[PDB]
Design a protein around this nucleic acid. Structure first.
Ligand SMILES: [Mg+2]
Ligand SMILES: [Zn+2]
Ligand SMILES: [Zn+2]
Lengths: 241, 917, 72
DNA sequence: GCCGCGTCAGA
DNA sequence: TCTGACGCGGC
């Protein structure tokens, strides 16, 4: 079970590996003080060097010279969960997650359709880091709904006014739970003191818009027969009007 | 709009807090001692919070309907319904301001982030430990400059006036007050425009947001330091008297009764012009009591009462599992409910349940009242109540007609998945225990060793129709987790079927001829044929093809007397080829699945009805039972043990003369015992599943009719391992860690064990037993987290229109496929088309797969396609009805309104109670 | 489940949710029409199921049902 | 710009 | 016990 726990709360395990999205040479030659670097820039067409410090208490994953690509394994060990999202793209991360989870499940006689796992994965992917200051601020975390609506606000209103550039970020399940919008649901979940005293400052408004709020106040939740009502009664207007 | 539709939170100015107050509290009094009436202007003052009785002042003068909105004059009491003692606050006047603890010790401290100082530096000022320049003055000092007492004295010496450095909450409040924003926002945004946020300006990022927020809302930032704090209506902190002539205060009454008289003494001191030391001590004691009232334990050693418990402060009521949110807002002990012990009742149908007439009389009582009154057998309410108290005879009839079609709910305590709650239709029974159809005891995960179920009633017209349409047991055949059915026969419904569906070589009536089922029935009841005989039956019936055809099938088939007895129940539409085999569990499930997918839903429940009704019948005419000679120890056991122990002596030899090391000796001993135990275990399989007999002509081996072999070759109840430990030998017992013990247990349960051999086993016994109890809280934890993450995923729209998904392929593991593509991608729609390696297209984009079309994938040799995952839908804060595919619980495309997030959440952690390692 | 079930009704109306709301409206209408003259509800079923039967036998054509709300 | 030592928050 | 997010002090 705790293996699954690690999978879901998006934990980067102990000393997994390193990556480099700046393709170039594959070598060493910096100071041998547990700060081994590389020549990962071209160094021939573009005279540069783009490397990072790292210890020398293990083996290596490259020879004295190679055409090192952008994001290949540079040290053995487990696979980080936060790198693949920004290096191998999205779909690679998804395939990794599914082939892990369905394995750890089926290996004990269980049966679980994938479409249950993926519709959980989806909620860990609601936040990106912003690059182009269109109208929001800088690289602080922001919803994909927020971006995806304000981008479209600018997209045709003014001209497009250079809307947005962002990149998906991976956050755990609890971390993506408390980080929601509705302060009521978050306040019910846990860590109530903090969320209440934080939303108190920002004069936070909370449109109900959810399932764990219409229950706190006794309303037809916006699912099930609730939407059936909001549909059928709405279809009465078009007649009596 | 007549209905509020947003909710907002905000800071309370001292002018709002007064606007809420229906008065003011002045002396720490609650209730008079001799007579229990409220006191003048204390914490129960009826003049402020409200009256006590209804339409009646305290002094009892103004007591008549003539005067209702009237305000008495002897006591200041109003005259109105007492129901206002719970929605009418007060307030308390604070002599010196006092810091709201929350905005100081919430990590990060908003006060700290604002004043841009480290907390402990603030607390020093607050705890009367320094001073701090409030007036800058020509003197070269700094505003937020902490000054010790003697350095302050020297500043006074050299500069006198022109600067003030006060200590205490007034200091912080004055600072926050004289803190212009537009003087600061851009000044800091320019230091951030000097962006080098490697370590320094990784800090200055938040202050931007805070100062912008405080500008955006319209809140005076000095409001975070209270000057008047409010009180809570008394009926939320009552003082009700209870038995023993005693009373039950609430912990809040005490903290209030403390802050009050501390404020009072402070005012008296400030009056009398005392020395500043005791002024300081009072002004600090007051802050302490205020913080305790808000939430004690945030900073100190939280106060306790006589019983020495840490008191239940204000904030401690709206957090924690026992708090206010997840305790009484999602809790709510409800009415119209009951609970008792469950028993089996194998006569019902899949939509019924027993109900003791007592609990029925109780749960439906008002319905009974209404029907009696309308029936003209009682005219008042006291009438009906007095006639039901004595259980008149007409009561039972009218009760029975009340509940003709009024479904109820049933629930079992640990409710892991939506099948943990289903709706049945009651029918009166005597006795005092609930009966439920056995075929569902797998969903509720119940067994009859004492489990107790609850029962709730629906009341409305929408509800008790929603229970009928969405919640009745005859709707829940397949599991939401996976399309596999959930009502398959389980324990000895399987034994009887497997038993009467076997064969025997030389039996009576063998090779006979029969025209139809009734013939075989008439014959078998006469007692000449053996039920396991082989006969020939001529059948003729329709059969449904895959493509919706229905072709006729006829002829003569070589069957068994037993299987023909099941010919009656098979509905017209399914081929006999299903029943014409040995019928172990994996095939009964096959029958039910096949029935559902082609014939309907009702056909399946009726079929399962008849299957149970028959399996129960023939599982007792066979008198299956279990002796002890049914457990047969294999014959070669002693010598197979002798070889092993001799090899062990040899290994001990190789060690004793130091010819071999230790660890290798240990490991090889382990392997020795393991392999020999494996052999002696595999032996009893042939020693119990085979029986030879000198049948006419010779002795030939046949599959045995042993009891304990049949109990496990039919998947009814058991497994090979238990058989091993019964007839074979226990083997290796792992000491707590898991490192095996270098002595294995050679005996077995039919033979019993010696004391030491039992002791060696109790270790693992206790460990494994304790490991469940220390899990039962963990899986619930994980499913709770998951329900939170995705509680608001709802299928809202038909199509999201996009054209992007994922690439699926059979998940090989270097040794096997272990999941075919044609199973991994069943029932999931296709992102784009698929081109044959010969060139022609095969399946178009947007084409929901189906066990017809899923032949056309392993047919033409395909091993990769693009499907529409919810990871790649395009709708905002929801899900389209195509990026999700088949409902996998009703075999159709997902209807719009199925809260998919919750289903997926509780179909992950639910089986987690079993996956251990 | 005396005679009629959801599997029947689901052929005319759809999504099994619309069924709930439509049947509820119809049963409310049949209830408020004073059908409770009390010499019938002891020989037959509650209106909550009368409505389902009416929808199964395809008598009402729920497209019509809503047009009884404007009749309110 | 970081190797260890704290508090808080849920078990 | 822990596991971490988040620190905010020695260098
Ligand atoms: Mg039990
Ligand atoms: Zn009075
Ligand atoms: Zn979609």
């Amino acid at each position: 079970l705790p293996r699954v726990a690690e999978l879901f709360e998006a934990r980067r395990p102990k000393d997994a590996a390193i990556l480099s999205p700046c393709d170039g040479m594959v070598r060493l030659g910096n100071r041998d003080t547990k700060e081994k670097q590389r020549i990962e820039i071209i160094d021939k067409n573009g005279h540069i060097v783009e490397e990072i410090l790292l210890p020398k208490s293990r083996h290596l994953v490259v020879f004295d010279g190679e055409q090192v690509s952008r994001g290949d394994v540079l040290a053995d060990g487990p696979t980080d969960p936060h790198d693949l999202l920004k290096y191998k793209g999205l779909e690679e991360f998804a395939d990794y997650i599914l082939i892990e989870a369905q394995s750890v499940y089926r290996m004990q006689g269980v049966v679980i359709n994938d479409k249950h796992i993926e519709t959980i994965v989806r909620q860990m992917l609601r936040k990106a880091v912003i690059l182009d200051e269109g109208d929001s601020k800088f690289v602080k975390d922001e919803s994909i709904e927020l971006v995806r609506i304000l981008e479209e606000n600018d997209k045709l209103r003014k001209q497009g006014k250079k809307e947005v550039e962002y990149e998906l970020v991976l956050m755990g399940i609890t971390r993506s739970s408390l980080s929601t919008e509705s302060f009521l649901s978050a306040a019910s979940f846990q860590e109530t003191t903090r969320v209440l005293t934080e939303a108190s400052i920002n004069s936070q408004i909370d449109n109900l818009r959810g399932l764990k709020e219409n229950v706190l106040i006794g309303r037809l939740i916006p699912a099930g027969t609730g939407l059936a009502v909001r549909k059928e009664s709405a279809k009465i207007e078009k007649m009596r009007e | 709009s007549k209905k509020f539709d947003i909710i907002k939170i905000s800071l309370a100015s001292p002018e709002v807090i007064r606007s809420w107050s229906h008065g003011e509290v002045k002396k720490p009094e609650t209730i008079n001692y001799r007579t229990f009436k409220p006191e003048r202007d204390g914490l129960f003052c009826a003049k402020i919070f409200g009256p006590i009785k209804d339409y009646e002042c305290l002094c009892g003068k103004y007591k008549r309907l003539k005067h209702r909105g009237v305000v008495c004059e002897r006591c200041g009491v109003e005259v109105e319904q007492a129901k206002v003692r719970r929605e009418r606050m007060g307030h308390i006047d604070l002599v010196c301001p006092v810091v709201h603890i929350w905005y100081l010790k919430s990590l990060p401290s908003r006060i700290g982030l604002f004043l841009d100082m480290p907390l402990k530096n603030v607390e020093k000022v607050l705890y009367f430990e320094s001073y701090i320049v409030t007036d800058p003055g020509m003197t070269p000092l700094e505003k937020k400059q902490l000054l010790t007492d003697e350095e302050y004295a020297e500043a006074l010496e050299n500069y006198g006036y022109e600067f003030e450095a006060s200590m205490g909450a007034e200091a912080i409040r004055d600072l926050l007050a004289d803190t212009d924003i537009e003087s600061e926002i851009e000044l800091l945004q320019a230091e951030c425009e000097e962006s080098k946020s490697t370590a320094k300006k990784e800090k200055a990022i938040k202050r931007l947001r805070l100062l912008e927020t405080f500008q955006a809302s319209g809140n005076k930032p000095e409001w975070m330091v209270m000057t008047v704090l409010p009180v809570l209506p008394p009926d939320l902190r009552p003082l009700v008297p209870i038995e023993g002539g005693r009373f039950a205060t609430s912990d809040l009454n005490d903290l209030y009764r403390r802050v009050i008289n501390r404020n009072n003494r402070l005012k008296k001191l400030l009056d009398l012009n005392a020395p500043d030391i005791i002024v300081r001590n009072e002004k600090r004691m007051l802050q302490e009591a205020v913080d305790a009232l808000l939430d004690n334990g945030r900073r100190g050693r939280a106060v306790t009462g006589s019983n020495k418990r840490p008191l239940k402060s204000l904030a401690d009521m709206i957090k924690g599992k026992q708090g206010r949110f997840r305790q009484n807002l999602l809790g709510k002990r409800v009415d119209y409910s009951g609970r008792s012990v469950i028993t089996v009742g194998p006569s019902l149908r899949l939509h019924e349940c027993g109900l003791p007439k007592k609990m029925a009389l109780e749960l439906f009582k008002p319905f009974v009242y209404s029907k009696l009154r309308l029936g003209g057998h009682a005219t008042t309410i006291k009438q009906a109540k007095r006639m039901v108290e004595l259980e008149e005879a007409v009561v039972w009839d009218i009760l029975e007609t009340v509940i003709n079609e009024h479904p109820v709910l049933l629930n079992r305590a640990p409710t892991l998945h939506r099948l943990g709650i289903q709706a049945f239709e009651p029918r009166l029974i005597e006795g005092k225990a609930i009966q439920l159809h056995p075929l569902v005891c797998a969903a509720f995960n119940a067994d009859f060793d004492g489990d107790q179920m609850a029962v709730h009633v629906p009341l409305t017209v929408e509800s008790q129709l929603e229970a009928r349409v969405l919640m009745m047991s005859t709707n829940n055949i397949l599991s939401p987790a996976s399309g596999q059915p959930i009502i398959t026969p389980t324990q000895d419904i399987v034994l009887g079927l497997y038993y009467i569906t076997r064969e025997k070589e030389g039996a009576r009536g063998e090779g006979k001829l029969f025209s139809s089922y009734e013939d075989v029935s008439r014959a078998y009841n006469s007692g000449t044929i053996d039920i396991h005989a082989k006969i020939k039956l001529r059948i003729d019936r329709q059969v449904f093809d895959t493509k919706g055809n229905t072709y006729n099938e006829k002829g003569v088939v070589n069957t068994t007397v037993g299987r023909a007895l099941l010919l009656n129940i098979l509905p017209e539409g399914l081929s006999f080829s299903l029943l014409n085999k040995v019928l172990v569990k994996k095939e009964i499930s096959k029958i039910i699945n096949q029935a559902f997918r082609v014939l309907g839903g009702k056909a399946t429940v009726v079929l399962a009805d008849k299957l149970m009704y028959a399996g129960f019948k023939y599982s007792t005419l066979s008198g299956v039972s279990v002796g002890v000679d049914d457990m047969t120890i294999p014959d070669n056991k002693e010598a197979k043990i002798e070889e092993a122990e001799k090899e062990i002596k040899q290994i001990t030899e190789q060690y004793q003369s130091s010819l071999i090391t230790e660890n290798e000796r240990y490991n090889n001993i382990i392997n020795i015992w393991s392999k020999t135990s494996d052999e002696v275990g595999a032996s009893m399989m042939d020693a119990i599943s085979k029986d030879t007999v000198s049948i006419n002509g010779e002795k030939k081996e046949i599959e045995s009719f042993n009891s304990v072999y049949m109990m496990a070759k039919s998947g009814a109840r058991g497994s090979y391992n238990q058989m091993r430990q019964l007839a074979g030998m226990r083997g290796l017992m792992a000491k707590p860690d898991g490192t095996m013990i270098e002595t294995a247990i050679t005996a077995n349960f039919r033979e019993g064990l010696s004391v030491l051999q039992y002791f060696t086993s109790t270790h693992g016994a206790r460990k494994g037993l304790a490991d469940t109890a220390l899990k039962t809280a963990n899986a619930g934890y994980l499913t709770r987290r998951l329900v939170d993450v995705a509680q608001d995923l709802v299928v809202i729209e038909e199509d999201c229109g996009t054209d992007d998904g994922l690439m699926f392929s059979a998940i090989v593991e270097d040794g096997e496929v272990k999941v075919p593509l044609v199973e991994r991608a069943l029932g999931r729609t296709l992102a784009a088309d698929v081109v044959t390696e010969k060139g022609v297209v095969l399946l178009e984009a947007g084409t929901l797969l189906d066990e017809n079309l899923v032949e056309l994938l392993d047919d033409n040799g395909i091993d990769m396609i693009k499907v529409r995952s919810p990871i790649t839908c395009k709708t905002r804060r929801g899900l389209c009805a195509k990026c999700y595919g088949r409902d996998l619980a009703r075999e159709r495309q997902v209807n719009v309104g199925e809260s998919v997030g919750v289903i997926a959440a509780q179909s992950i952690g639910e089986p987690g109670t079993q996956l251990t390692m | 489940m005396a005679r009629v079930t959801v599997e029947d009704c689901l052929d005319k109306v759809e999504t099994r949710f619309d069924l709930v709301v439509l049947a509820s409206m119809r049963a409310n209408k049949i209830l408020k029409n004073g059908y409770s003259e009390s010499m019938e509800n002891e020989k037959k079923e509650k209106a909550t199921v009368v409505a389902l039967r009416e929808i199964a036998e395809s008598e009402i054509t729920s497209e019509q049902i809503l047009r009884n709300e404007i009749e309110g």
